[PDB]
Design a protein around this nucleic acid. Structure first.
Lengths: 142, 246, 140, 166
RNA sequence: ACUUGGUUGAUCCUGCCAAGGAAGCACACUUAGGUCAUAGAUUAAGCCAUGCAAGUGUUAGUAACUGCGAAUAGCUCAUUAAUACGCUCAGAAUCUAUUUGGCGGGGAUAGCAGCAGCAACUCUGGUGCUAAUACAUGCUGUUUCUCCAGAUGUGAAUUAUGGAGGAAAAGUUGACCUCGAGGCACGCCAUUCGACUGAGUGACCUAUCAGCUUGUACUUAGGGUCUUUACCUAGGUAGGCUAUCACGGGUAACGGGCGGUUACCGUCGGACUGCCGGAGAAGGCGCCUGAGAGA
RNA sequence: AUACGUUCACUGUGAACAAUCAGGACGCUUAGAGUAUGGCCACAUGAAUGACUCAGCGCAGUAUGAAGUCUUUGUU
RNA sequence: GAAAGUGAUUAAAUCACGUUAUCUAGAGGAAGGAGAAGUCGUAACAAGGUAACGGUAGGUGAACCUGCCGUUGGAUCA
């Protein structure tokens, strides 16, 4: 459904005299079933829209579900320190765009992979969710 | 901000070339060409510090401009022209034919060869694409755009190339059980028979074998498929990319 | 025991170490800087014009008057007392000359019997006292 | 000049960011074309790597395109009714991309009888065709391209934008 | 892989202070010879007389014009606390003179000739001509939009390419040197030297710096750019960072390869470092020419 | 129904990534250095290797240490 | 197919406010250290001639004194 001033339109498709464009992203991901039976458009989705996925592929637990079609991960990594022969827990808050194909709560691990810049902060896009139930603030390395 | 810069220093010049740390600061910057900066070897350096004909660099720029030298059919009066892997070098006056090709260790060597062999050369497919009227065409490790190339010509295939006419006579297919000289990294300059090809998700690995019976991997882009099953399509050096080991 | 030993505990060890350096007086003196507000200005040798000649005397038990000149410096325009070594030597220095001053050699602090002053006169008029005291160079 | 550079602006964390260098001609913005209607003229612009972005200042006609029938005629643009970004583009009749502008369609009407007398047509469009001013969208980039052209407004789109005007 | 003098009448301790070894600036006294390396960084990125440092002629464009160069090299470390630098990736979001390989298809001025003006300069006015691989002319593609298909190629593109339509000139039209050979254009695709955009991540102190942030954070549409993005302008939400140290302050802070000290672990220094990358030309700021400059 | 049935950390192995430092060869008259130099009949060479090194990448091994495991009833 | 004009934009420069940091003048005030065998006491070390010492309140030239409550590092391991 199309609320705003501009008419929202699925690109690369002509009505002629509904249809939906759907894309296999590859790298071992099953292109999920709810993309193929749902009214949303989004050009910044991997599957429906026009964003090609490429390069580095991350995992981490979700913090925020607050913005429209954007979430925040925290990647969670150990840093070896040479002197003290011992690691320390570090983290990094990585904001990442979501397709409305997915259904994402707070506090569940996802995967992401990078694309072109969609904003200042966003350069990543969600390609697979695992659900989790039920919290965040665990430190979890993968 | 950096631009395209003329003055190559020694030290920063590559470790192929066997340059003195002394004998001045600057080395000869290669001109732009088919081959890259790092892999190549100019013909200013070729006549100074292999065959040892031109003692000074003034004398080296003399003999290229007399037009005795021929890179690969053509004359080339430009000098400092990058020449690297499988290029023929015909030389006028006391004429000798060479092919430029790697040592055991990674260094360049220079090899007197028979004239009937020294017609042709090999050319690996780097990039395959379509363009102009549905026609497939191929770039090489030179940068020879071989258009109207035949089928069974995919990436990492060699092409034997006749030089007098712009032909592609054979095509040595990539496979298991096929000889391949490595041309970059740590295993640069080494012959191997290809036992395994490991596909790599996204951005792949290939495992090799000497006649001695050592074993070593590399990235796929480094291998140059030299000829089909033991016997290659080329005169190889002394030792034959085996490399000593005690 | 008496510290964190665990595998993940390297933030505790690194950050606790930074605190304990501020107890150490050498790290404290270097870092504070803290050295600039000094007549020397952190320079081993300084030069400038003599104001006059002063008698400062030793503490105890050593009864002796030491003879240290007052010297204005070139670069700061401050004034500071400065010892003159070797017997004679106050007579060799002359009034209102340029002199080169250096440190007492104690890396700061006040040295021998002599309190207050932390400075000795190396040269006068571009010559050096040892040469002058020995008399293998001259002054006009 | 006008800069395309973003280093000066604050981080995500909200930190006062500081320059380390001058402005640079990698990241040079230029002024807007502000592409109105009436009298054709163009200003050529040198860019990175030689080349020409032919910037269009004011354009009369545009090469518009009936999509469903496959037919496309050089047609005179009259006015901007609507634009989804700004109402300022409507007031001064600026041609941007996505700009909903009516067209005379004299050529399209001629096309229908010269072909036919197939065709069929829709009941919304015949309510438009009696006036002789079709709604249509500019799809080109007038400023970069220097040429403006767009397809006719039709189908489910033609319901939507007609409510936004009314 | 090292000890010794100093609190006591004497003792054993804790404990520093000195002594002791190295280098790196500076002062000093003294000095047969050889090779080799370095030398106005520390303070004043303060100021400069004079001389010189970027020009360029081939048997083959015609003193000039024309073509290319001058954006490199050289110098310095004042900014900069991570945006720079390093190290991994990435271009399916890009530009690229020159080389190299494919594919292609007549009139008007400069010196020269002449008349003048300034205290002065590597400033010129005005008339009288003539040059071309300079400039303009001229016997299917390029750019963009719409639609139908979407490869033998990729991890993946409704991508590459093909066909059917319209437009536009922003255009490929060897109008060419030297004696059958050498050389020079024009356009498009690649290639080469690179450039430029984005990501992850590493490290100097400070809590007598605990809250910071309004284009600030997302979204939809546009403008602009070589492209992607609050880069900038609109409409709609109210978000982002923070005790795993945000934000603020300090630096006698250019980063790195590395250098000095050492039994190991470390630790101090890094203008230079015989190299790499960045920044700056008295201080800001702006711009033309060009493949490339905020020179 | 002859390959598939958790991933990591950690270990081994493999890829990837100048000078200096360590180290091999060679009597620069020696040394610090340098990349040479040695054979009287046209020949033979050498300019290795390791470290620089944390992160990121692959296959193999599972002892230790993690995560994986929505149950007043879960999975196909 | 130049100059002049008008409106945009990037704006040096100067004028002015406001903080802010580093330096720096000040009659006086109140401390701290150093040095001369000054003056006034003699508080502490012995049951130091009222055992000392901690917290706190008041007082007096100065050390110190006294009140309330602690400790033994007491002069008692009873």
């Amino acid at each position: 459904v199309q609320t705003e001033r501009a008419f929202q339109k699925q690109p690369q498709l002509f009505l002629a005299s509904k249809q939906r464009y759907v894309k296999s992203i590859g790298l071992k991901i099953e292109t999920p079933k709810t993309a193929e039976e749902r009214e949303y458009i989004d050009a910044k989705c991997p599957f429906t829209g026009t964003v090609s996925i490429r390069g580095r592929v991350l995992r981490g637990v979700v913090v925020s579900t607050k913005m429209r079609r954007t979430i925040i991960i925290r990647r969670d990594y150990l840093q070896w320190i040479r002197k003290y022969k011992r690691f320390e827990k570090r983290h990094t808050k990585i904001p990442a765009h979501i397709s409305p194909a997915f259904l994402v709560k707070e506090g569940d691990l996802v995967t992401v992979a990078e694309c072109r810049p969609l904003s200042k902060t966003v350069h990543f896009n969600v390609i697979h969710v695992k659900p989790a139930a039920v919290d965040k603030r665990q430190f979890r390395v993968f | 901000p950096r631009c395209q810069r003329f003055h190559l220093k020694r030290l920063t010049a590559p470790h192929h070339w066997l340059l003195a740390k002394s004998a001045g600061k600057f080395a000869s910057h290669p001109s732009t060409g088919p081959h890259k900066l790092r892999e190549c070897l100019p013909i200013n350096i070729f006549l100074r510090d292999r065959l040892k004909y031109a003692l000074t660099a003034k004398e080296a720029v003399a003999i290229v401009k007399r037009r005795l030298v021929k890179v690969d059919g053509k004359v080339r009066t430009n000098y400092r022209y990058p020449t690297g892997l499988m290029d023929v070098i015909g030389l006028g006056k006391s004429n000798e034919l060479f092919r430029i090709i790697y040592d055991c260790k990674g260094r360049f060597c220079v090899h007197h060869i028979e004239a009937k062999e020294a017609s042709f050369k090999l050319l690996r497919v780097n990039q395959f694409k379509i363009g102009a009227k549905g026609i497939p065409h191929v770039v090489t490790h030179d940068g020879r755009t071989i258009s109207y190339v035949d089928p069974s010509v995919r990436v990492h295939d060699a092409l034997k190339f006749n030089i007098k006419t712009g032909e592609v006579e054979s095509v040595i297919k990539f496979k298991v059980g096929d000889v391949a000289m490595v041309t970059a990294g740590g295993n640069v300059g080494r012959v191997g028979t290809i036992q395994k090809i490991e596909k790599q998700m996204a951005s792949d690995i290939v495992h090799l074998k000497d006649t001695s019976g050592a074993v070593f991997a590399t990235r796929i882009m480094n291998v140059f498929v030299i000829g089909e099953n033991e016997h290659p399509l080329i005169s190889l050096p002394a030792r034959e990319g085996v490399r000593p080991s005690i | 025991k008496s510290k964190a030993c665990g595998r993940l505990a390297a933030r505790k060890l690194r950050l606790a170490h930074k605190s304990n350096l501020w107890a150490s007086n050498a790290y404290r003196r270097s870092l504070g800087t803290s050295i600039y507000k000094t007549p020397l200005e952190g320079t081993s040798m300084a030069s400038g014009i003599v104001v006059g000649k002063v008698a400062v005397e030793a503490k105890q038990p050593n009864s002796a008057i030491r003879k240290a000149v007052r010297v204005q410096l070139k670069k700061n325009s401050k004034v500071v007392t400065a010892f003159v070594p070797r017997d004679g030597s106050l007579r060799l220095i002359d009034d209102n000359d340029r002199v080169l001053i250096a440190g007492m050699g104690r890396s700061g602090r006040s040295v021998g019997d002599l309190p207050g002053c932390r400075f000795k006169v190396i040269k006068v008029a571009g010559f050096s006292l040892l040469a002058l005291w020995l008399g293998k160079k001259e002054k006009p | 000049g006008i800069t395309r550079m973003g280093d000066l602006k604050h981080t995500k964390s909200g930190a006062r960011q500081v320059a380390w260098r001058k402005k640079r001609n990698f990241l040079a913005g230029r002024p807007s074309a502000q592409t109105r209607i009436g009298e054709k003229r163009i200003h050529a612009v040198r860019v990175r790597g030689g080349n020409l972005k032919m910037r269009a200042l004011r354009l009369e006609t545009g090469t518009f395109a009936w999509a469903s029938e496959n037919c496309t005629r050089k047609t005179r643009i009259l006015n901007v009714t609507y634009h989804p970004a700004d109402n300022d583009l409507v007031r001064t009749n600026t041609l941007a991309r996505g700009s909903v502008v009516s067209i005379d369609a004299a050529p399209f009407k001629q096309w229908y009888e010269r072909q036919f007398g197939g065709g069929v047509v829709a009941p919304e469009l015949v309510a438009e065709f009696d006036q002789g001013r079709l709604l249509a969208v500019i799809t080109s980039r007038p400023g970069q391209c220097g040429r403006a052209d767009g397809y006719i407004l039709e189908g489910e789109e033609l319901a939507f934008y007609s409510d936004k005007i009314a």
